[PDB]
């Protein structure tokens, strides 16, 4: 049964490849050669947020852009005030290891995931007293790699035992589960309409997931290694993925295959995070040789290098209005770039 | 209004800074340890007033490459072992030759003293006579024990360069305490560039 089913899968994958190849008419470079390039704009460090002790593993901006949340490994979750470099709230963490942090679009909830398999939700308003754990989502059996909010009530989480899950807070149970990959789901990003979330895993697979349905519509296999971090193009029609083979690839949703690949011979280190600018002409990628090369998104050129850090950059965030870029590295410094 | 909010923000920022100072003091007092043979189990103890938080992975899937990278900050990894021995050797080599684990010292424990079939290099082996065999035992057990220790040493010496060290031991808390003190003293000598 295995041999005939394997033959059928081989035939069908060949059909999907042939169909994508027939739909492939050009590369993005051929048509977009006639555009003015960015040239070079280097950025200047403007703020330096030094309050952490251990390495800063994840940072998340807020929709207000006044405030950012950063999570270290010393068990401290700190809500910085990026304009006036002050610490609004510092929160103690029950478990030392925290691999992600998420900040709500209302600015009332902060979600931190660790190795302890328990997503925690912190209420910020708290007229009774301090910020405190309110409800904790404990369903996964691997670890929790990334987490994101859809609204104040429902939170999507990417586990490390292959099952992405959609969570409800006031009940506490998984509304739905996503079971597509064969690997550790590293990072998920959300579309700007918040109906579809891409998933990055360790089997070099990018998948498109529908939130209400719970099925993977598409599969993007163009990487040679695991996908560290994934970011949508800011309209919701494409996305970029970062891997450990020193390639950032731009994947198209509706043409279903890779538009462009950002890789140069002098780069032999893994991408840890990818992000876009406001318009999307600039692609920001954190690299493992301690700097953040900036990529011209339509021309595949290196616009500039953000070389302020001293250790591995772990997280990289861009504000909603696009004013600044804040990178976080393992030397316990958040550098805000303009 | 503005004066009140700035003064209040100064007070809140100073209170948070003082809390971070207290946390820094207790954090530096703490020597984290990793034991690899609820997603994570914590064992806390203290030997001569020095606090050791030891963490053991709980229900973690067997693929190890992603989550281990977080553990580079640790002082030492306690590695306990018992064709199982070859898998343990391959694991130790992977930990030793990682791009991020070059600063962590590995502390090695040889539990369940042993076999002979899997290693046709064992027949050509002689006991290290610089070392002192522990009395009241079996010559074959001693020969096998030192043979396994030598295999771990040969894996260790490949591109070691003094960045991090491997300590081999036999079966427990005092041994870990002495080894952690040794690692800290070597790290301090490296800072002053005496070594």
């Amino acid at each position, epitope marked *: 049964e295995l041999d005939q089913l394997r033959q059928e899968a081989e035939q069908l994958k060949n059909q999907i490849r042939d169909a994508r190849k027939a739909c492939a008419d050009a590369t993005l470079s051929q048509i977009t050669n006639n555009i003015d390039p960015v040239g070079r704009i280097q950025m200047r460090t403007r703020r330096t947020l030094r309050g952490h002790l251990a390495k800063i593993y994840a940072m998340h901006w807020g929709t207000d852009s006044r405030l950012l949340v950063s999570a270290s490994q010393d068990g401290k979750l700190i809500i910085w005030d990026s304009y006036t470099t002050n610490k609004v709230h510092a929160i103690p963490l029950r478990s030392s290891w925290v691999m992600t942090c998420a900040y709500a679009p209302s600015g009332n909830y902060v979600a931190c995931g660790g190795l302890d398999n328990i997503c925690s939700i912190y209420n910020l308003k708290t007229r009774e007293g301090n910020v405190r754990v309110s409800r904790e989502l404990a369903g996964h059996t691997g670890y929790l790699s990334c987490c994101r909010f859809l609204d104040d009530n429902q939170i999507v989480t990417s586990s490390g035992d292959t099952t992405c899950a959609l969570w409800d807070i006031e009940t506490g149970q998984q509304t739905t589960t996503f079971t597509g990959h064969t690997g550790d789901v590293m990072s998920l990003s959300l579309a700007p309409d918040t109906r579809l979330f891409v998933s990055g895993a360790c089997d070099a697979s990018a998948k498109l997931w529908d939130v209400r349905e719970g099925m993977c519509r598409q599969t993007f296999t163009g990487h040679e290694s695991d996908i560290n971090a994934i970011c949508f193009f800011p309209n919701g029609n494409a996305f970029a993925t970062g891997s450990d083979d020193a390639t950032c690839r731009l994947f198209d949703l509706r043409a279903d295959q890779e538009l462009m690949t950002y890789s140069h011979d002098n780069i032999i280190c*893994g991408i840890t995070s990818v992000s876009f600018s406001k318009s999307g002409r600039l692609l920001l990628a954190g690299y493992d040789d301690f700097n953040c090369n900036v990529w011209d998104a339509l021309k595949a050129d290196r616009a500039g290098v953000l070389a302020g850090h001293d250790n591995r950059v772990s997280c990289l965030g861009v504000t909603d209005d696009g004013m600044a870029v804040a990178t976080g590295s393992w030397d316990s410094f958040l550098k805000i770039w303009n | 209004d503005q004066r009140n909010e700035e003064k209040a923000q100064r007070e809140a920022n100073k209170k948070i800074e003082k809390q971070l100072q207290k946390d820094k003091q207790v954090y530096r007092a703490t020597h984290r340890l990793l034991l690899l043979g609820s997603g994570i189990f914590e064992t806390k103890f203290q030997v001569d007033k020095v606090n050791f938080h030891m963490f053991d992975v709980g229900a973690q899937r067997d*693929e190890r490459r992603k989550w281990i990278q977080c553990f580079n900050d640790v002082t030492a990894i306690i590695f306990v072992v018992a064709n199982r021995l070859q898998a343990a050797l391959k694991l130790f080599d992977s*930990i030793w030759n*990682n791009k991020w684990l070059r600063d962590t010292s590995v502390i090695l424990f040889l539990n369940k003293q042993d076999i002979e079939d899997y290693f*046709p290099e064992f027949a050509r082996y002689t006991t290290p006579e610089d070392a002192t065999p522990e009395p009241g035992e079996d010559p074959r057990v001693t020969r096998a024990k030192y043979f396994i220790r030598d295999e771990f040493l040969r894996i260790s010496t490949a591109s070691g360069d003094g960045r991090h060290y491997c300590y081999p031991h036999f079966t427990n808390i005092r041994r870990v305490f002495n080894d952690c003190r040794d690692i800290i003293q070597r790290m301090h000598l490296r800072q002053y560039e005496l070594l």
Partner: nanobody
Amino acid sequence: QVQLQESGGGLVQPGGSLRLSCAASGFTFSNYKMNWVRQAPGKGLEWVSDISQSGASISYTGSVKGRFTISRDNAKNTLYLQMNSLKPEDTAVYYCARCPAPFTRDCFDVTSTTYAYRGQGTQVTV
């Protein structure tokens, strides 16, 4: 799309010179330290041999010393295993595998719970 295919195997007279060939498609071959992993039936996966990025660093399991030869060519991008003087108790499925990152030395691919980049294997009966 990354897949490792294996050609060879089958019944062999004990002692027979059977060769296993792994064909790599979907990645740059010259950058990955590629290894062979075998699963005996009713037994977890066990590493056999590995060869480095160039073809200089070669290592074996203790039980397969001096009987198995591992050689890699970059141009035909194939991981080639030569087995000589076989034994009936060492019969197993043989999986071609790839260590997950370029330009590195460490590997984490003994894991039976579906490592993402190994091949599907060939039964090899002695």
